[PDB]
Design a protein around this nucleic acid. Sequence first.
RNA 1: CAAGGAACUCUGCAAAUUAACCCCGUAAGUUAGCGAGAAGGGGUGCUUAUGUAAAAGUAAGCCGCAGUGAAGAACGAGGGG
RNA 2: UCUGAGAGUUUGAUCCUGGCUCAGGAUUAACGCUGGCGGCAUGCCUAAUACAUGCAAGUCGAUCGAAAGUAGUAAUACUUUAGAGGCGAACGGGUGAGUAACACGUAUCCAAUCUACCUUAUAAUGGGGGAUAACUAGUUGAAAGACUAGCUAAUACCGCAUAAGAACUUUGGUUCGAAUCAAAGUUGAAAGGACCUGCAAGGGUUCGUUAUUUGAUGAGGGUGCGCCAUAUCAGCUAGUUGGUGGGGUAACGGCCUACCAAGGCAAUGACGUGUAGCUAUGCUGAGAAGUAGAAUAGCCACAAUGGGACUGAGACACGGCCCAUACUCCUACGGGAGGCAGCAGUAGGGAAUUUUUCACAAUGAGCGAAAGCUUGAUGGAGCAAUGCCGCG
RNA 3: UGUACCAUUUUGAAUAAGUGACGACUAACUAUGUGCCAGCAGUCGCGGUAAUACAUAGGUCGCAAGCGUUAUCCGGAUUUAUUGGGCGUAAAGCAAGCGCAGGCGGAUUGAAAAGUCUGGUGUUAAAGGCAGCUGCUUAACAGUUGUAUGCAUUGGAAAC
Lengths: 83, 77, 122, 87
Amino acid sequence: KRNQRKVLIGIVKSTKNAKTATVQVESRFKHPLYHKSVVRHKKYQAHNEGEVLAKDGDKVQIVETRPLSATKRFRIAKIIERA
Amino acid sequence: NIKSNEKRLRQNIKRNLNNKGQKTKLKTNVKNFHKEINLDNLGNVYSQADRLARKGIISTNRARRLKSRNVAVLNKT
Amino acid sequence: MVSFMTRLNVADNTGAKQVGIIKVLGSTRKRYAFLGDVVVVSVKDAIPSGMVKKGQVLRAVIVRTKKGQQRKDGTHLKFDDNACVLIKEDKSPRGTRIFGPVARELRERGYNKILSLAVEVV
Amino acid sequence: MVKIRLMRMGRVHYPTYRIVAVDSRVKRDGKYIALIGHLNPALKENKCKIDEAVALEWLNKGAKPTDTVRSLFSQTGLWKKFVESKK
RNA sequence: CAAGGAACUCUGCAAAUUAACCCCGUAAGUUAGCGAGAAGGGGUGCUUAUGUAAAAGUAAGCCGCAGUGAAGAACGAGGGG
RNA sequence: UCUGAGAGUUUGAUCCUGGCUCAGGAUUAACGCUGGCGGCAUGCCUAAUACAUGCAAGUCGAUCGAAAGUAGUAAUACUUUAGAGGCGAACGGGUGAGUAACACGUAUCCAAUCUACCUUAUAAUGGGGGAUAACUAGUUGAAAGACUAGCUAAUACCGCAUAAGAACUUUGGUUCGAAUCAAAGUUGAAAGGACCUGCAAGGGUUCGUUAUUUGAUGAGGGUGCGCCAUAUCAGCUAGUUGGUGGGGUAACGGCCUACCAAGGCAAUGACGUGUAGCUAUGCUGAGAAGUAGAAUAGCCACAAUGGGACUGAGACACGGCCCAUACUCCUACGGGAGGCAGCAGUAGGGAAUUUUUCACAAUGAGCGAAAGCUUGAUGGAGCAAUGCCGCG
RNA sequence: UGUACCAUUUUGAAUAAGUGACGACUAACUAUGUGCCAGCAGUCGCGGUAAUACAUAGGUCGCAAGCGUUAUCCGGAUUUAUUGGGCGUAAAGCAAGCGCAGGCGGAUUGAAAAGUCUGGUGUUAAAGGCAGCUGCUUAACAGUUGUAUGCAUUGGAAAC
C-alpha cells in the first residue's frame, strides 16, 4: 500500500455551504533569508459526509484523494474532539 | 507543399466516410435501445460497439463506459 | 447617381472607410457622376494606420452605384451601395486590393489596372 | 523502441562516444535513463570498456542494439550470456 | 416621390425621425438633491400547453414584408453667452 | 577544511558623518589603429520585420494489379513504379511573441490514467462478399485539372462460422474501493507475401495477422513547497461556491447540462498594472549571495494572424485539411498560388554579428528481409583577431 | 584529403609589430611651439609668453597580435548592514495619549512532539564547478572517476 498521506491538523471555520466545510491550516516555516520563524494560514476544503456536524472550533485531520471538484480537493481522515 | 501529404489527403477521405457511417449506426442503435429496452437490442449494441472496438474509430474505454451505462439501465429490475 | 457632397463607401485597401464628394468633374454643372466618371473627393474618415490622413483632397473613380444605369444591350445593372477607388492621376489605384464587384463600363474609359485587381467584374 | 545508440561527446575531429540507453524518439546527445560505459573509437586495443551491469538489464527488459553496438556486444561476449539466458 | 441627405438658407424655419407597456443598460459633472425616460439596445401577432386568485411570465407551434400591424404618445450628442 | 588588501576627493589645517571616482575580473560586445601563423570555442542581443532564389522525410515490387522498358519463337525471366497499399509523417530543425501560472524547479500520488513499433509467454493465422484507383471513352481547358459511364487485384473494406482467455453485467462466498476464484448470459478474431519440402497428400521455415499476459517506454492529470515589482491597485468573482439527475471525457471534475441555495477568494495582498519563457548554469563574491538566463541541455509555448475539426494510437499537426483576416506573387481577365522564426541568401533596422559551400565518410533517424534510398539533422570545409591558448 | 604529419628534401635572415601612458592616484621625462587661445581630462585639475598635464620631437616605460575607448554585470560598497549600519548637535524618535490585530512575554510539574537535533531509505539528468587521473608535442582543450546541495518519508531524543 504505497499511496502517500499528508497528516495536517486543521481547524473548521464555517460549513455554511451545504454539506461542505472549510478548514484552516497553520504551517510553521523559516523565512528563507531572515531565519526567523513565522506561521501562515492556508484555507483548505473538505465536504461534510454527514458522520459528525463540525461546528465552530472543531479541529480535524485531512487525507489526500482524487479531485472531487474544483476548489474542493481533500477529504477528512481522522476527527479530533472539540476544545 | 510536399508530395507525401496530399496522398494522405486522398486516403483519409474514404475511411472518414466509412467511419462516419459506422458511428451513425452505433448512434441509431443506441437510440433504439433508449426508445425500447430489452436484452436483444442491447446485445446488438454490444456487438456493434465491439465491431469498432477492434479498430481505432471509437476509443475502447468509451465503448466499455457506454455499455456499462446501458447495463445500468438494464438493472432497473 | 452620386452627386455633389455625397458620402460614400470606399472599395480598396487604402483605409478610407468613409469619403464624401467634393466636386464632379468633366464639365460645368455636371451635377451627376455615373459609372466610370472620375470625381474628386475628400476623405472624412480613415483608419489610424492608413496611407491617407483625414482631410486630404483626392480624385477617385466610382465603381458601384445604388441607382444603377441602363446598359446598351438592354440589361440594367444596379448595386446597393456607393463605392469608389482611389486613383493616382493617371490610371492606377492608390491601393493594392479591391473589395467587392466592379462595373464593366470602366473597361472602355481605361482603368484596366482596376479590372486586373478586381475580384469579379460584372 | 528504446535503442542502444552512440553519442558523439567530444571535440572536433575527436569523437568519444558514451554508449547510451536512449529511447527511439530522442535526438542525438540527449537525456537518457542509464549510462553504458563509453567509447573512444580512435584508440584501439580495448579502449572500449563497458559497465556490463545495467546493459544486460536493459536488454532483458527491452533494448535494441545498433551495428556499432553489435560490434561491441560481439567481442565482449554479451550474446553468449544473453541469448542462452533468454531460453 | 427613385439617387443624394442641409449642398437650401440670414439661421435645419418648416417639414422629417423616436414615441405605449415590459426587459437589459446608463457617462462626465454636482451645491450629493440631481444629471436621467441620460446615451445605446431587445420583445409585443395568433394557437396550444403550462401558468396562479386573475393576469403577467414560460415552453412548443403557425402565419405575414411588416405583429403598441390603424388611431395616441419624448429625436439626440458636444461647447459657449 | 575554505578563506577578507586599498586609494584619491569637502578644510587655512584636523577628526567624523557622508556621496562620487579609481585600482580587479567578465561580455553573443562594438569603434579607432595595427595585424603573421597555428589550435580550440563562438559568430542578429535590434524586426515572432517582409522576403528573389536553390535544397531541407521519405521509403518499400519478397503487398497489389497494371503500365513502360529488356532478353525470349513462345513459354517465360529481369529492370522502374504513375497509382492503390504498409510504415514514417506528431521525431528531428528554428524562435522565445505570448504566458506571473501547477508555466517551471522539485517531492509526490494517480483506489483516476492510457501507451503502436520494443519485451515474457498463449490461442488461433478458416471460408466468402462487395467495391475503386490506374486504364479507356467522352465533356472540358494551353496546363493545372475537373466531371461523366464501364473494367479490375490485393496486406483496402465488409458480413459468416468457432472464440484459450479476454470485454461487460447476473449469482455465491474471499481480503483490508481494491483483487482473486467459481458458474451463467451477450458479444466480438485475421491476410496473406517469399521460400524449402512434398509426384502428391501434406508438413515445415522466414516474413506477416488478430485476440491475449507481464513489462519497458512515452504522454497526461493532481497536490506540497519554492518560484517579480507595484496599495500613487480595496474589494473581487455569478459556472463564480456548494449539492442533486443526466451526458460527456483516456480518466477526475460546473466540463456541460435540467433543478436548488448564495456562496467563495481577499491586508498572510485578492483583483489590476507593467515586467518576464522557467531550470541546470555563466560572471562576480570568502560568504550570506548579487546578476544574465550566451553556446548547450531538461521542461514549456509557437509556427503570417485568428478559429474549427477529420485522420492517426499519439496533432488540434512548423514545409496536413477547412474557414476567415492581412500581405504578396503569377496569369491567356477566364482564374489560380504562397506562407524563410529550417540551411544558405536578399531588403530594411542597427554601430554590429558569416558561404545562395561539400559528403552521408562516421553517429543517427525513417523505410526497406536485401541491395539500397532521403537527411542544409549530422559530419566536414569557407569567412570573422570576436574570445582563450601556443608559435614566430 | 595527398589531410595533418613525417622524411639529414630546395633555397633563404631571409616571409611578419604595433599599441597606451609618462603631474599625482599608478611604473615612465626633457626640449620646441602655443600663451585662458588653440586643446586635455576617470578624480584632483592643467595653459592669461620658461606648461614634465595642450601640439609635436626625442627618450622612457606598461601590454602586445593584439592595444586602447565606449557600453553592461559583480566586487571593492559594511554605500540597504541576516551574517554586517544608525536615529542629541552630521540624513533619521511621529506633538502627545487610548488602544484592536500582530510580535515578544514570570516560575513549577506531565504529556504529546510542530519546530529543534541526530539514524536509515528514496530522490536531487548529463554537461559545467572542485580534485585526481587519462589523452591530445603541452596549456587552450577533450575524456574518466570521486566530490557536494535540498526535499519527501521512516527510528529515535525531549534541553528549549
